Design an enzyme around this catalytic site. Structure first.
Site, PDB file in Angstrom:
ATOM      1  N   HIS A  76       0.846  -1.155   0.000  1.00  0.00           N
ATOM      2  CA  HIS A  76       0.000   0.000   0.000  1.00  0.00           C
ATOM      3  C   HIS A  76       0.904   1.235   0.000  1.00  0.00           C
ATOM      4  O   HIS A  76       1.643   1.468   0.920  1.00  0.00           O
ATOM      5  CB  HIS A  76      -0.979  -0.008   1.197  1.00  0.00           C
ATOM      6  CG  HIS A  76      -2.170   0.881   0.984  1.00  0.00           C
ATOM      7  ND1 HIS A  76      -2.064   2.246   0.808  1.00  0.00           N
ATOM      8  CD2 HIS A  76      -3.489   0.593   0.879  1.00  0.00           C
ATOM      9  CE1 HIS A  76      -3.261   2.766   0.612  1.00  0.00           C
ATOM     10  NE2 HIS A  76      -4.141   1.777   0.628  1.00  0.00           N
ATOM     11  N   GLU A  91      12.169   1.052 -18.318  1.00  0.00           N
ATOM     12  CA  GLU A  91      11.316   2.150 -17.850  1.00  0.00           C
ATOM     13  C   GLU A  91      11.095   3.294 -18.809  1.00  0.00           C
ATOM     14  O   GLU A  91       9.949   3.589 -19.185  1.00  0.00           O
ATOM     15  CB  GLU A  91      11.828   2.667 -16.527  1.00  0.00           C
ATOM     16  CG  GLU A  91      11.812   1.578 -15.485  1.00  0.00           C
ATOM     17  CD  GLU A  91      12.136   2.062 -14.094  1.00  0.00           C
ATOM     18  OE1 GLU A  91      11.854   3.237 -13.788  1.00  0.00           O
ATOM     19  OE2 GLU A  91      12.647   1.234 -13.272  1.00  0.00           O
ATOM     20  N   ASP A 104       5.815   4.111 -14.658  1.00  0.00           N
ATOM     21  CA  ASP A 104       7.206   4.514 -14.894  1.00  0.00           C
ATOM     22  C   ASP A 104       7.384   5.179 -16.277  1.00  0.00           C
ATOM     23  O   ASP A 104       7.893   6.307 -16.405  1.00  0.00           O
ATOM     24  CB  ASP A 104       8.105   3.276 -14.813  1.00  0.00           C
ATOM     25  CG  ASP A 104       8.202   2.687 -13.389  1.00  0.00           C
ATOM     26  OD1 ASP A 104       8.015   3.405 -12.395  1.00  0.00           O
ATOM     27  OD2 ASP A 104       8.495   1.498 -13.267  1.00  0.00           O
ATOM     28  N   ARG A 162       2.868  -1.692 -12.135  1.00  0.00           N
ATOM     29  CA  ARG A 162       1.711  -0.943 -11.781  1.00  0.00           C
ATOM     30  C   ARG A 162       1.337   0.124 -12.811  1.00  0.00           C
ATOM     31  O   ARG A 162       2.161   0.563 -13.593  1.00  0.00           O
ATOM     32  CB  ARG A 162       1.900  -0.286 -10.406  1.00  0.00           C
ATOM     33  CG  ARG A 162       2.984   0.733 -10.302  1.00  0.00           C
ATOM     34  CD  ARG A 162       2.710   1.709  -9.148  1.00  0.00           C
ATOM     35  NE  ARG A 162       1.645   2.665  -9.556  1.00  0.00           N
ATOM     36  CZ  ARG A 162       0.574   2.921  -8.816  1.00  0.00           C
ATOM     37  NH1 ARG A 162       0.415   2.357  -7.600  1.00  0.00           N
ATOM     38  NH2 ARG A 162      -0.329   3.752  -9.293  1.00  0.00           N
ATOM     39  N   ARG A 202      10.261   9.435  -7.973  1.00  0.00           N
ATOM     40  CA  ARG A 202       9.673   8.095  -8.266  1.00  0.00           C
ATOM     41  C   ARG A 202       8.206   8.164  -8.744  1.00  0.00           C
ATOM     42  O   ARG A 202       7.492   9.117  -8.470  1.00  0.00           O
ATOM     43  CB  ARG A 202       9.812   7.200  -7.043  1.00  0.00           C
ATOM     44  CG  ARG A 202      11.280   6.999  -6.683  1.00  0.00           C
ATOM     45  CD  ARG A 202      11.417   5.995  -5.581  1.00  0.00           C
ATOM     46  NE  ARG A 202      10.929   4.701  -6.070  1.00  0.00           N
ATOM     47  CZ  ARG A 202      11.648   3.801  -6.738  1.00  0.00           C
ATOM     48  NH1 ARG A 202      12.942   4.002  -6.990  1.00  0.00           N
ATOM     49  NH2 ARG A 202      11.053   2.678  -7.135  1.00  0.00           N
ATOM     50  N   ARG A 246      14.069  -6.787  -5.957  1.00  0.00           N
ATOM     51  CA  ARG A 246      14.321  -5.793  -6.967  1.00  0.00           C
ATOM     52  C   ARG A 246      15.374  -4.770  -6.556  1.00  0.00           C
ATOM     53  O   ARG A 246      15.318  -4.208  -5.484  1.00  0.00           O
ATOM     54  CB  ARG A 246      13.037  -5.024  -7.309  1.00  0.00           C
ATOM     55  CG  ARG A 246      13.232  -4.117  -8.518  1.00  0.00           C
ATOM     56  CD  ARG A 246      11.934  -3.474  -9.014  1.00  0.00           C
ATOM     57  NE  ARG A 246      11.391  -2.442  -8.122  1.00  0.00           N
ATOM     58  CZ  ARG A 246      10.630  -1.433  -8.534  1.00  0.00           C
ATOM     59  NH1 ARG A 246      10.368  -1.268  -9.802  1.00  0.00           N
ATOM     60  NH2 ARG A 246      10.170  -0.549  -7.672  1.00  0.00           N
TER      61      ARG A 246
END
Lengths: 927, 929
Positions: free
Chosen positions: B165, B552, B589, B627, B752, B442
């Protein structure tokens, strides 16, 4: 008992049964009770024979094993004439029960709450827009104001023209029995039914089924056209008469819900019914001037009788003693001039006192309605009447006036609320039905008018109208349309046809103009055809001439129509006569007989576009009258999308469509369906003028044009150029037998469609689509995708395919194969085989274009209804096939079973008529 | 009154209420009870204040009169710290209640009986195909045999990877309170409820709502171990039992298409994984010790869950008839059996041999117990004397005795009984194994470069970092076949380098069933992947983790195909990966780099291109969905998203992220949990046999043209405007999110993706999701008016385009440019307000083009149930947006003063209010970009 019958029926129709799906249950309960009745009336043995026929047919409909047809054939051909008749009666009656059950299922089927918005939703009664949802789409999606929507609806007219059942006008008495069967059935499924009510309803259901089955006199004589018209008017009493004000009240509610705070004016002429029954004499010399006079008087008699038969109820309610001056004065007038003595009425038989002022006003209306009715009755039966004009209503205004007076008086005394009850309903019924609840169209063919004019020209010694060119005909007609002396002298020689045609004009000149609608010209080709009828009406000095409406039937006639209309609209005399308005009729089934249904459909789309443009250019408002055979004559939800599919501006506030006799029962028999029929006509008409479908892409027109050339060529090479088509048609269908109760070209469209519908083959509907599709796909593989895009995206194309697909679902080429084997000579059997091969291939291209694996996977509720009927129809097809054999071949015999039925000299032709009627009642509409 | 609250709520959402639509009712009842509780706990005055905030916000959401926002502002900015906190707590709590109500409404909403067949039906839970309907379409429309369908599903794998979360990991205790509130609520609407039951359920509902509200302690961030344990709660709540319930539905569906066997209990159809304690990208708090602890925690929980249900199974397995094989094993265990008390709840005395299944299962319980206790001692004490043969070290050891129980029942005539709880247990074991989630590691590529650079320089051979890509490859391949280790005991190590090496050490020491993929963040090249392969080799990891690049940026996506081709051309690598490769994409990303429109289209193309390259080299490719994509929405939209994938990109193996802010919706309520598993399984199956249409060439060309324009607009605003960053820091709470924690941030480029999306979501503006679509649409339409129709046809007909627009449309429905305007006015300096204004103008224009392309007059007119849910939450979120806006002013601006009302609440600063508003706004917004 019941469960086992439910079991058999359920196997026929897999599907996903929720609580509102009771159709199989209904059919089981009706078949169960009917089987008890058969056992009772005719013995257990006969009951078992019926059951056996049903079983074999249901098995054959399962796997389509030809063997099952043969067994069914063996059983049915072994029956004597008496037993045959009982079996055909039984299976006909089961079809009617199944139809009534289906009507109940459609009435109570749940509406889909969230509609996807796609036009395709308007093809299905569970998803279609009702009148409020139509108002809201126009407001929210097309940015119309509520006031603009209200104002367009107020100026809108929907006219529905009722035509005769091609095979079996159902009598009033039987209709009412059917209605009570349907009701008993619905009440049996009412929530919280006590067991005794259930037991009693059950016994009532049994009794009504039996009463209907035993209303079965085989009456030597064809029905007279007067009797056919009266039978054809039964739906007004059953549903339409009350249905109209129920729908107009829904309009009031819907208006209110979009913020319009007044009711739809009681006298806006939103809904009008008309009729061809006793008016259409095209190819029918039994329709005489006397017939036309009688159906006008009948319509007047019934209309005044319907007002009369509900005025006492309104009198009872209108007990109020508060009234305005205007009505007080009128009431005291009537009261003073009032009869001291008994009126022979059910309710207000003594003199009405003046403290009941509304009853005094309405009492006078009742006496007038009564006299209006009696005059018409004496005119029919005695040939005239001493009842004078001021004792009756001769115009609708005279009837509206006192009703409006009642309305204003209630409003002025604070009782607006009460005025908007039955009084408002009654006002609306008067405004919709007038003094003749249907206006009658006259129809006759152009050549009959040519013949009449030729008799005139030659008697005048000036030559022969028939020998004259189109230009000369126009010239002479325009000269005589302003002529200073009459054309017709007392010694004009007249053949019977010529006299019959002139005397029709005489009836038109004598009867009131509110009896009549349009004068339709069958087989119209030219300007002069229209002017010819105009001249005859002028010669008879008709005070309000009927509007003249050409019916351009063949493809060539459709192609010449635009120049014909342009020439009419260019002529000052004619422009002046029509006063800014013209109606033109198209006949889908007519055009399809000439050129195949595919090409007729596309050509009618184009001709309507072209006529609409020409009308605009000349400042004329155009109404297109839709004849039979189109997607708009389907009834049910499919009619909704069909209407919305019309080329742009072809409705423009005025819809006129044929309600075909074989559709009337589905459209108007059950009261919910009657309401939803009126609603979709009014909603679609409204929507279309403000929300036209997409116009086709140029690539789509071009491919349509190419496909039509090929479709027409295939249709015409089979139907007109194959020298043995006619012979094959006479053997493979009951066409000849239907006719006794110049080739296909001179065959009328209804016998053409009907004959092939009877064999479950339906050639007139699909022939030509196959070559069109194949040629398009083979010329360029990309065309398959283009056609699929057209199906998904182009409403015209979508509806045109859907109608053919429905007809395939009613088709069964196995029946046609059995007929070939029984009826067709060996040397033609390969021809019949190659037609069946075309059927299959055509069906498969259609499926591919529609994106369906199976017929009607779009519309499972419609497929379910068709499948449930199939075994009954199939039994009748087989009975018919062997009957035709016996009738055609007096040396065909089979060993006959000992007589099966009990009781406690009908022939083969009687059995045939029963099969033909039952099959047509099961097929309903096709092409 | 309840009725008066119903009235206000109903005005907010017009619609066509049938019997299954109770959502407004649910929300009224919950708000009504919560108001009583507030009055009780905090006084009538405070209750009236909350009510008044709610009323003003609901009115504002009705007509959007600015005046109502001002009054709401005046009220909220007059509250002291204590009252502010109570108010923010109250509104946050109401959002959770509303979400629970919505879940219950989705669970009981009626299915549409007759589906139109259009792919659009798969976007909506009421219309989507269940697993049987999926089987039937494949059989009857795509002409697959039942056997072909059965065989494809048996070889299919769906792997769902749970991530943290981003803002508030919900603790187990509170989760369970939420569940009980949801149940009381459902039961209050049960058919035929007695009045006393209704009165008692009412009091229970009241009590739960209060218990949840008072679970509200506010000092330290949660440790990554606590975040992982919080994040695992849904297994206990629903997924543990949900899996065998769904697999039993698969049995039923199979039976209904004529397959007369069950789905094999050990087909690995469903697999769960996790990033919690495994992802250290930009996060130095995720240490090797953290990773070790979450592996042991996952092992402890898993063996605990089997342990805690084995006694129930023992009770049922009372049967005395068994086969020889099991008889012999039972008598073995019985002879070697302890005479004395076992400290268990149920079978504490020695089990007799006439209860043979209990004897077998008794031994399984002891093993489970020891397996669990070993893990616990390893966590708490740092090691354990519990030996290997006392525990399960491989899943096969646990399956075996259960399989033996199964066969023995079958052989004795009791197949039917075997297929009850025993079968469920077998499926749970086969699905969760000995670690219910496998952990992905990761770390970013540059960290591996740094480690290898330290090595090369200590070896005296140069600098890996300076070496070209070709030289890197050459050295890596030489060392990948090297004959001596690389790392000597005196290698100099910075803390980062050590941290990265020691992670590999944890990987070498722990069992391989703890781990999934090693994901490389910011991957750009072939050498990035070989670098990780060399480090695993150097640590002699017996089962190396598969190495998965995450490309990315747009430029990285464009270089991916050559990178993959080169890897696949190398014999050492081909031999290492054994016919299989996984690649990861990150929608959010890529969207941060290039705008979401261009990232979407590029990701479509890159997936196509990598699929083709894999085929050519005979490698099976898995695309791991990170995501931010349409596939991360959850609910029905996920179903059509999955079906929208480019052809052959699933090919029997799905791997997708279940984002932390979506987990509650996806899995919290047992019916939604079941439906979530179902649509993942059904869509994955369908897609490999029924790909969507491939786009028309005209469509690709326009997509390309549109991307150039979208990317240009997105980049000129986000990267080339010299004051965008300064604006962003004023208009959003981005900075405060940072200083109240992962870590968050070289500008936007080094910010980010989560803080980027989150910051703009908080202001109800959502720039990251829509920016660029506007220029793309306008440029296309103005270049050629015909493009409007082309775009509409794409919307109607191309699933990728349809789902891509729908996600943006859902985000616009969660937007409100009044909130952004208020933030500008309060927080942004005057000279930057025009900038904010011009962004609002772009928002409007972009929304309208989208609406036009979708054929909608109003946002979400496609999806009224979704619109309804969003609208009922709006008043709560709006109250929190206003509270937050003025809180940020007070925090930032020592000049700002307002007269404070006397303290309102009874019973019996600013930063805390802000954290509450931030969490509540996030819980109400859920997923966006």
């Amino acid at each position: 008992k019941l469960a086992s019958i439910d079991a058999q029926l359920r196997l026929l129709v897999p599907g996903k049964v929720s609580e509102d799906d009771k159709l199989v249950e209904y059919d089981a309960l009706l078949l169960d009770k009917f089987l008890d009745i058969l056992q009772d009336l005719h013995g257990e043995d006969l009951k078992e024979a019926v059951q056996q026929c049903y079983e074999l047919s249901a098995e054959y409909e399962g796997k389509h094993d030809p063997k099952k047809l043969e067994e069914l054939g063996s059983l049915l051909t072994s029956l004597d004439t008496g037993d045959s008749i009982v079996i055909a009666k039984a299976f006909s009656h089961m079809l009617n029960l199944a139809n009534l059950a289906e009507e109940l299922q459609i009435a109570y089927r749940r509406r889909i709450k969230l509609k996807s918005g796609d036009f395709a939703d308007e093809a299905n009664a569970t998803t279609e827009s009702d009148i409020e949802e139509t108002f809201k789409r126009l407001v929210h999606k097309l940015n119309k104001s509520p006031e603009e929507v209200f104002d367009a609806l107020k100026n809108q007219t929907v006219e529905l023209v009722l035509t005769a059942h091609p095979t079996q006008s159902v009598r009033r008495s039987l209709l009412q029995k059917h209605g009570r069967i349907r009701n008993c059935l619905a009440q049996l499924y009412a929530k919280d039914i006590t067991p005794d009510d259930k037991q009693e309803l059950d016994e009532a259901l049994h009794r009504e089924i039996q009463a209907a089955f035993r209303t079965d006199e085989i009456r030597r004589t064809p029905p007279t056209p007067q009797d056919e018209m009266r039978a054809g008017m039964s739906y007004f009493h059953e549903t339409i008469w009350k249905g109209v004000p129920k729908f107009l009240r829904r309009v009031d509610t819907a208006l209110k819900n979009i913020g319009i705070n007044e009711r739809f004016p009681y006298n806006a002429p939103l809904i009008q019914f008309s009729s061809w029954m006793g008016g259409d004499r095209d190819g029918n010399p039994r329709v005489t001037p006397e017939v036309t006079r009688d159906v006008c008087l009948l319509a007047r008699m019934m209309t005044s009788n319907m007002y009369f038969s509900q005025i006492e109820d309104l009198m009872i309610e209108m007990s109020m003693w508060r009234c305005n001056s205007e009505l007080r004065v009128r009431a005291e007038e009537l009261y003073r001039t009032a009869r001291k003595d008994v009126k022979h009425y059910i309710e207000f038989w003594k003199r009405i006192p003046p403290n009941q002022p509304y009853r005094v006003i309405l009492g006078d209306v009742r006496d007038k309605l009564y006299n209006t009715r009696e005059r018409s009755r004496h005119l029919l039966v005695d040939g005239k009447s001493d009842i004078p004009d001021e004792a009756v209503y001769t115009n609708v205004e005279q009837l509206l006036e006192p009703l409006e007076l009642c309305y204003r008086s209630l409003c002025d005394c604070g009782d607006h609320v009460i005025a908007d009850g039955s009084l408002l309903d009654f006002l609306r019924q008067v405004s919709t039905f007038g003094l003749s609840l249907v206006k009658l169209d006259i129809r006759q063919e152009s050549d009959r008018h040519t013949e009449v004019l030729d008799a005139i020209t030659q008697h005048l010694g000036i030559g022969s109208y028939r020998e004259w060119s189109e230009e000369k005909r126009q010239e002479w007609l325009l000269a005589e349309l302003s002529g200073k002396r009459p054309l017709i002298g007392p010694d004009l020689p007249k053949t019977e046809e010529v006299k019959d045609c002139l005397d029709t004009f005489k009836v038109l000149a004598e009867l009131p103009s509110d009896c009549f609608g349009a004068y339709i010209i069958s087989m119209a080709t030219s300007t002069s055809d229209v002017l010819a009828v105009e001249l005859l009406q002028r010669e008879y000095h008709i005070k309000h001439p009927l509007r003249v409406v050409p019916l351009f039937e063949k493809l060539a006639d459709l192609e010449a129509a635009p120049a014909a209309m342009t020439r009419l609209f260019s002529m000052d005399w004619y422009r002046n006569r029509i006063d800014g308005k013209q109606e033109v009729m198209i006949g889908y089934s007519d055009s399809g007989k000439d050129a195949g249904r595919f090409s007729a459909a596309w050509q009618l789309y184009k001709t309507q576009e072209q006529i609409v443009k020409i009308a605009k250019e000349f400042g004329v408002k155009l109404v297109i009258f839709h004849g039979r055979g189109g997607t708009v004559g389907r009834g049910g939800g499919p009619t909704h999308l069909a209407l919305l599919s019309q080329p742009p501006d072809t409705i423009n506030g005025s819809l006129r469509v044929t309600v075909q006799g074989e559709v009337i029962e589905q459209s108007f028999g059950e009261e919910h369906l009657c309401f939803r029929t009126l609603q979709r006509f009014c909603a679609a008409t409204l929507e279309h003028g403000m929300n036209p479908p997409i116009s086709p892409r140029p690539e789509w027109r071009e491919l349509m044009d190419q496909m039509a050339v090929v479709a027409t060529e295939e249709y015409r090479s089979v139907v007109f150029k194959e020298p043995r088509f006619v012979e094959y048609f006479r053997l493979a269908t009951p066409e000849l037998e239907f006719g006794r109760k110049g080739g296909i070209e001179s065959l009328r469209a209804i016998p053409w469609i009907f004959s092939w519908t009877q064999t479950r083959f339906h050639l007139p509907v699909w022939l030509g689509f196959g070559a069109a599709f194949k040629h398009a796909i083979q010329k360029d593989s990309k065309n398959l995708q283009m056609l699929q895009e057209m199906y998904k995206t182009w409403p015209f194309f979508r509806v045109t395919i859907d109608l053919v697909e429905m007809v395939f679902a009613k088709g069964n080429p196995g029946i046609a194969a059995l007929n070939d084997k029984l009826l067709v000579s060996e040397d033609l059997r390969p021809f019949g085989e190659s037609l069946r091969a075309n059927y299959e291939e055509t069906k498969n291209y259609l499926l591919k274009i529609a994106g369906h694996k199976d017929l009607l996977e779009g519309d499972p509720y419609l497929k379910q209804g068709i499948r449930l009927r199939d075994p009954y129809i199939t039994t009748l097809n087989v009975c018919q096939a062997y009957t035709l054999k016996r009738i055609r071949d007096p040396n065909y015999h089979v060993t006959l079973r000992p007589h099966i039925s009990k009781e406690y000299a009908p022939g083969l032709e009687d059995t045939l008529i029963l099969t033909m009627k039952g099959i047509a009642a099961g097929m309903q509409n096709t092409g």
